[PDB]
Design a protein around this ligand. Structure first.
Ligand SMILES: O=P(O)(O)OC[C@H]1O[C@@H](OP(=O)(O)O)[C@H](O)[C@@H](OP(=O)(O)O)[C@@H]1OP(=O)(O)O
Ligand SMILES: Nc1ncnc2c1ncn2[C@@H]1O[C@H](COP(=O)(O)OP(=O)(O)O)[C@@H](O)[C@H]1O
Ligand SMILES: [Mn+2]
Ligand SMILES: [Mn+2]
Length: 274
C-alpha cells in the first residue's frame, strides 16, 4: 500500500496518495521523462515531474506498492556491470581510495583485499563493484538479488554471496512461497518486459547500469515487475547502439542487461516446473 509505510535515504513521503518522492538527479530525471514517451512507459513507475521539498528537488513517482495489500518486494539489480566505464578512468587518472568500501569488503571477506589494499585500508570503487559482481550472480548470470521486504515485515539484504543459478532459484522459491499464480504472473510480465526492451528506442540508445527490476506481489496474488533506478543509465554517443547481451569489454559500454533478463526468465520458468 506504500513504500514509506515500510520505511517507518533518497526517498520521502509525497503529499498525494499513490505517489512517492525520490531525490532528483539529472541522469535519472532525463531518463524518466524519455521513458514516459517510450515503449517502456508501462514497464517503469509513472514520472509526474519534479517538486521542491525544503529547497530540494524530488522526482514525483508512482509508489509501485500502492495497489498491493501487504506487499512482498524483491529488488533485482540488472546487468553484468554495475558501474560506469568513467569510474575506471577516474580510478586510474586520480584514484579516490574508498576506506568505506575496503571496510564493506572486509566485512563480507577479510581475505578478498590484496596486500596493497590491506596496507591502504582502501580500494577503488570499480575494484569493489567488480568484486561484488563476481561473488554474487552479476558476473555469470547478469543480475543479482539485492533484497526482499516481506508481508510479515521481515526485510533481508543478505544476498552478497548468492551466486549459483540454484541459489537464486531458492531465493525466488522462498519469496513466492508456493503461489503458482504470482509466479505465472511474474513470468508473463518478464516475457512482456523482454519484448518491450527488445523494441524500445530508449533501450537501444542507452547504457543501462545500476537499474533494478522490482518484483511486487501480495497474498491476493497481485504481481507486478517494474524497471527502477535510472541514476546511472546514460545515453550512448552519436548513433551508437548496444545488443545488451554480448560480454562487456571496456569501450564497448555493454551492460549484459538482456543476458540478465534471459537468465532470470529461465530461472523463474525452471521454478514453475518444480
Ligand atoms: O544502491 P544500489 O543501487 O543497490 O547499489 C549501488 C551502490 O552499491 C553500493 O555497494 P553495496 O551494495 O555493496 O553497499 C556502493 O557503495 C554504492 O556507491 P557509492 O558508495 O555511493 O559510491 C553504489 O552506488 P552508486 O553511487 O549509485 O553507483
Ligand atoms: N517508484 C517506487 N515505488 C515504490 N518503491 C520504490 C520505488 N522506487 C524504488 N522503490 C523502493 O526503493 C528501493 C530503492 O530504489 P532505487 O530507485 O534503487 O533507489 P537508489 O537510487 O537509492 O538505489 C527499491 O529497492 C524499492 O524497495
Ligand atoms: Mn538502486
Ligand atoms: Mn541509483
Amino acid at each position: 500500500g506504500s513504500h514509506m509505510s515500510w520505511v517507518q535515504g533518497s526517498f520521502k513521503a509525497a503529499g498525494t496518495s499513490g505517489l512517492i518522492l525520490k531525490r532528483c538527479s539529472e541522469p535519472e530525471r532525463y531518463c524518466l521523462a524519455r521513458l514516459m514517451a517510450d515503449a517502456l512507459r508501462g514497464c517503469v513507475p509513472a514520472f509526474h515531474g519534479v517538486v521542491e521539498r525544503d529547497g530540494e528537488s524530488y522526482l514525483q513517482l508512482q509508489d509501485l506498492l500502492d495497489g498491493f495489500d501487504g506487499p512482498c518486494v524483491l529488488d533485482c539489480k540488472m546487468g553484468v556491470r554495475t558501474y560506469l566505464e568513467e569510474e575506471l578512468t577516474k580510478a586510474r587518472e586520480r584514484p579516490k581510495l574508498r576506506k568505506d568500501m575496503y571496510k564493506k569488503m572486509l566485512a563480507v571477506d577479510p581475505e578478498a583485499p590484496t596486500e596493497e589494499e590491506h596496507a591502504q585500508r582502501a580500494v577503488t570503487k570499480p575494484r569493489y563493484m567488480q568484486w561484488r559482481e563476481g561473488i554474487s550472480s552479476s558476473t555469470t548470470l547478469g543480475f543479482r538479488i539485492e533484497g526482499i521486504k516481506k508481508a510479515d515485515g521481515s526485510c533481508s539484504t543478505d544476498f552478497k554471496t548468492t551466486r549459483s543459478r540454484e541459489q537464486v532459484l531458492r531465493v525466488f522459491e522462498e519469496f513466492v512461497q508456493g503461489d503458482e499464480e504470482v509466479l505465472r504472473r511474474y513470468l508473463n510480465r518478464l516475457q512482456q518486459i523482454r519484448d518491450t526492451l527488445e523494441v524500445s528506442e530508449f533501450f537501444r540508445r542507452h547504457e543501462v547500469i545500476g537499474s533494478s527490476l522490482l518484483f511486487v506481489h501480495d497474498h491476493c496474488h497481485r504481481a507486478g515487475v517494474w524497471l527502477i533506478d535510472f541514476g546511472k543509465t546514460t545515453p550512448l554517443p552519436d548513433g551508437q547502439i548496444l545488443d545488451h547481451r554480448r560480454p562487456w569489454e571496456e569501450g564497448n559500454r555493454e551492460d549484459g542487461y538482456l543476458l540478465g533478463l534471459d537468465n532470470l526468465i529461465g530461472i523463474l520458468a525452471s521454478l514453475a516446473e518444480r
